[PDB]
Design a protein around this ligand. Structure first.
Ligand SMILES: Cc1cc2nc3c(=O)[nH]c(=O)nc-3n(C[C@H](O)[C@H](O)[C@H](O)COP(=O)(O)OP(=O)(O)OC[C@H]3O[C@@H](n4cnc5c(N)ncnc54)[C@H](O)[C@@H]3O)c2cc1C
Lengths: 9, 132, 661
């Protein structure tokens, strides 16, 4: 899912 | 509501989706349209370069010195005859007629017509100028 | 507040009753506002008490003692609230010291397929509700897709690695109950291109900003323009990104065209003016000669000869004025034309290096969803976004296995027991398993209920690893087909010394091609020992499972050598390479919302199966076959907390059925 993305901004 | 610096219209989306290679087709037709406009620049700027060559020197050799002559209220016989010929060559262009004579304001030239209408048949002279 | 914060930490609205509550307390929610606020405070307060000391059981008596009037007035209301919370695993869940030892007399029998977190979570709840529970596990270990590598001091997760924030996370409660070493992950993560050169800071920021704008655009394309079906097929996220990029290239070209088109309009004005000035120069030249010849006639002269000099003079100064006005007009069009040449629009939308760096951000997205962007539903890929936890993401330095192992204590777990067939009827169920070590040794488990925690990958396997008798209905099997099961692999590199920056937890590697954007695109440094963990995401994961560990460790060392220099990178002491798609007890990494699927399929996966009656004209039976696991929890899919919560949910649904509410 989206939450796993690195440096999410 | 689209994000700033992104451009997404219904028409554009439909034009890319319509076909399986519509996207690539639309992008090449803009590329060919661009190459076509860039060669039409080279053509006109090379045409314009030639016209600048022909204007080299400006009109400085054909330029005439400025006349510093001071407008006078008294009408000499010469000035009257210059005027009648000015009325013959130019129409009611009061400005040109003043410039020809060289010492009569547009006001002074305005009055000339009414005073001498009778004596210099100015009606006849204007009819002769109109016929040409 | 403390009561309001307990509701938040339990993923409940503090000031409102949920659908689940409305069902168990219809009298209250249908009635007066004051009784609802009393209910909500009792609930919120009971939660607060549990959350403050989750290492010991919270009894009903203990709850009533710590309630002040008029909330402790109604003892039955407090008992109903406490019981509801306990049943649904909002309190007294995970690993806690029990005050009143479990009764020896057990009601009902449940077989749980799989001892993953979903299985273990359910098992504990059921056992603690006084049911007979047995877990069947194909592997020689518990934890499932929570898998921790251990050789000496080396510790590295091949499965779940990250706690996605503690704010509303039930793993917050578990971390207090189990000794997990939670270590915050530093968001800072530099990129390094094909050659090993760090992306310059200014450029990195530009591409990242462009990635987020491209995503925001796909969302606009989806919700505002309703671009969700194309050629009677669901639109992929990948497709939408291609289309958005093309429209950005299309604009760049359109922009250039409009700019060059206004340059030619100016050049054509100048051309039309120059022609006017060239014709006027000739007429000025001719008229100067005429005046010259007229003035060459020396005085004395008659008045017509004088008039000719004067008229030609006047005419020549007039034409010289016109040419001076045109020469001014020419001079300002040459300024305008030189300014347009000075400020051209952008040559290209994205450079070749930019597109390579953008591909790394797509790889990051392909890692998170564990699938190529061409498989994700444009509309629903992010459907769980509103339930993301708050707080810093953390790693488990202990190794995440510490959690399942803890949950497994005191549970009847048959390891090396591969379920082959699940039979369910009006009178009960048989689960048929075999020994993984010798397929000939057959086991038969008779139970009132089966909890299936088989991964979506397994449920999808054709031909089936597990046969259902009778077969699962079309509505269940259609959901299984529709739903996406992704892949994502990890390369574990154990060294003798740290040759990398200890203050940086992650660092990217940019691939040459789009086709390989996922291949070892990210490196993790989260562990005490000198261990680097490399992710294989996107299309690369599937393909890299056929390539041998040596070649993969090979491609890894090459990439690391390029960033830190040949002398700095030694040979690794221990290497491990995950192959989750090839693993027959996973058949992939975790679920994604595939194009053509939605959140609703997750709810379909969660729905239990009710057998037909044995004898026709017999009353409607009870449900026998239940489903838990990350593919069953719509609001927290593809996570450990999701698995955890899906287990607790099915334990409550099963208890409600077989022990009564
Ligand atoms: C590489 C990777 C990284 C991840 N990273 C994270 C992360 O950072 N954070 C996070 O929250 N989540 C993460 N996840 C997801 C997380 O691991 C899972 O969502 C969760 O562990 C799933 O638990 P489950 O009980 O639903 O399934 P599982 O853990 O797979 O449990 C199912 C069990 O069924 C068993 N089984 C299969 N077939 C049979 C059979 N025929 N008979 C008997 N038993 C059988 C399996 O062996 C397994 O033990 C990651 C997953 C992977 C693969």
């Amino acid at each position: 899912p989206r939450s796993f993305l690195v440096r999410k901004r | 509501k689209p994000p700033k610096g992104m451009f997404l219209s219904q028409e554009d989306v439909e034009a890319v989706s319509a076909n399986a290679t519509a996207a690539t087709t639309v992008l090449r037709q803009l590329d060919m349209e661009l190459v076509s406009v860039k060669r039409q620049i080279q053509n006109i700027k090379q045409t314009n370069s030639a016209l600048k060559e022909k204007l080299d020197g400006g009109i400085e050799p054909y330029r005439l010195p400025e006349v510093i002559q001071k407008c006078n209220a008294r009408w000499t016989t010469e000035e009257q005859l210059l005027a009648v010929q000015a009325i013959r060559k130019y129409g009611r262009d009061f400005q040109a007629i003043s410039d020809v004579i060289g010492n009569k304001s547009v006001v002074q030239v305005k009055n000339f017509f009414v005073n001498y209408r009778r004596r210099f048949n100015i009606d006849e002279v204007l009819q002769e100028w109109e016929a040409e | 507040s403390g009561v309001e914060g307990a509701a938040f930490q339990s993923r409940l609205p503090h000031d409102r009753m949920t659908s689940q509550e409305a069902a168990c307390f219809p009298d209250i929610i249908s009635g007066p506002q004051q009784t609802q606020k009393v209910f909500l405070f009792i609930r919120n307060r009971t939660l607060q008490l549990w959350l403050d000391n989750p290492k010991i059981q919270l009894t009903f008596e203990a709850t009533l003692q710590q309630l002040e009037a008029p909330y402790n007035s109604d003892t039955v209301l407090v008992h109903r609230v406490h019981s509801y919370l306990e049943r649904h695993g909002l309190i007294n869940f995970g690993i806690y010291k029990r005050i009143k030892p479990l009764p020896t007399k057990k009601t009902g029998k449940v077989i749980i397929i799989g001892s993953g977190v979903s299985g273990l979570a359910a098992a504990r709840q059921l056992q603690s509700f006084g049911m007979d529970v047995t877990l069947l596990e194909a592997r020689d270990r518990v934890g499932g897709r929570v898998a921790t590598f251990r050789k000496g001091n080396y510790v590295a997760d091949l499965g779940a690695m990250v706690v996605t924030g503690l704010g509303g996370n039930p793993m917050a409660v578990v971390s207090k109950q189990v000794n997990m070493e939670l270590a915050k992950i530093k968001q800072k993560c530099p990129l390094y291109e094909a050659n090993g050169q760090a992306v310059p800071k200014e450029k990195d920021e530009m591409v990242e900003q462009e990635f987020n704008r491209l995503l925001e655009a796909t969302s606009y394309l989806s919700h505002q323009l309703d671009f969700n079906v194309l050629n009677n097929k669901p639109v992929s996220l990948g497709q939408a990104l291609e289309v958005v990029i093309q429209l950005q290239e299309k604009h760049v070209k359109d922009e250039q065209i409009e700019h060059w088109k206004k340059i030619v309009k100016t050049q054509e004005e100048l051309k039309e003016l120059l022609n006017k000035m060239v014709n006027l120069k000739e007429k000025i030249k001719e008229l100067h000669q005429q005046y010259k010849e007229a003035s060459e006639v020396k005085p004395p002269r008659d008045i017509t000869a004088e008039f000719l000099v004067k008229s030609k003079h006047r005419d020549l100064t007039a034409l010289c004025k016109e040419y001076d006005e045109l020469a001014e007009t020419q001079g300002k069009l040459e300024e305008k034309l030189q300014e347009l040449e000075a400020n051209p629009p952008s040559d290209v939308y994205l450079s070749s290096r930019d597109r390579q760096i953008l591909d790394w951000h797509f790889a990051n997205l392909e890692f998170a969803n564990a699938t190529p962007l061409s498989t994700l539903s444009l509309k629903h890929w992010d459907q769980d976004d509103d339930f993301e936890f708050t707080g810093s993401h953390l790693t488990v330095r202990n190794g995440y296995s510490c959690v399942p192992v803890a949950l497994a204590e005191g549970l009847d777990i048959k390891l090396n027991t591969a379920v082959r067939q699940v039979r369910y009827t009006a009178s009960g169920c048989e689960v048929i398993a075999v020994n993984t070590r010798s397929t000939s040794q057959t086991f038969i488990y008779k139970c009132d209920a089966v909890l299936c925690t088989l991964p979506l990958g397994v449920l999808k396997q054709q031909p089936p690893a597990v046969q259902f008798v009778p077969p699962l209905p079309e509505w269940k099997t259609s959901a299984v087909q529709r739903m996406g099961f992704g892949n994502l692999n990890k390369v574990v590199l154990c060294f003798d010394r740290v040759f990398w920056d200890p203050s940086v937890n992650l660092f990217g590697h940019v691939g040459s091609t789009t086709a390989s954007r996922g291949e070892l695109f990210l490196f993790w440094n989260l562990y005490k020992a000198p261990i680097l963990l490399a992710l294989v995401a996107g299309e690369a994961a599937g393909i890299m499972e056929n390539i041998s560990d040596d070649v993969i460790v090979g491609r890894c060392l090459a990439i690391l050598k390029g960033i830190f220099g040949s002398s700095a990178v030694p040979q690794p002491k221990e290497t491990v390479v995950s192959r989750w798609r090839a693993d027959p007890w996973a058949r992939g990494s975790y679920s994604y919302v595939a194009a053509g699927s939605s959140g609703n399929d997750y709810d379909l996966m969660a729905q239990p199966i009710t057998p037909g009656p044995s004898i026709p004209g017999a009353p409607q039976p009870i449900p026998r076959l239940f489903f838990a696991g990350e593919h069953t929890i719509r609001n927290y899919p593809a996570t450990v907390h999701g698995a955890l919560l899906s287990g607790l949910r099915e334990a409550g649904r099963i208890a409600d059925q077989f022990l009564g509410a």
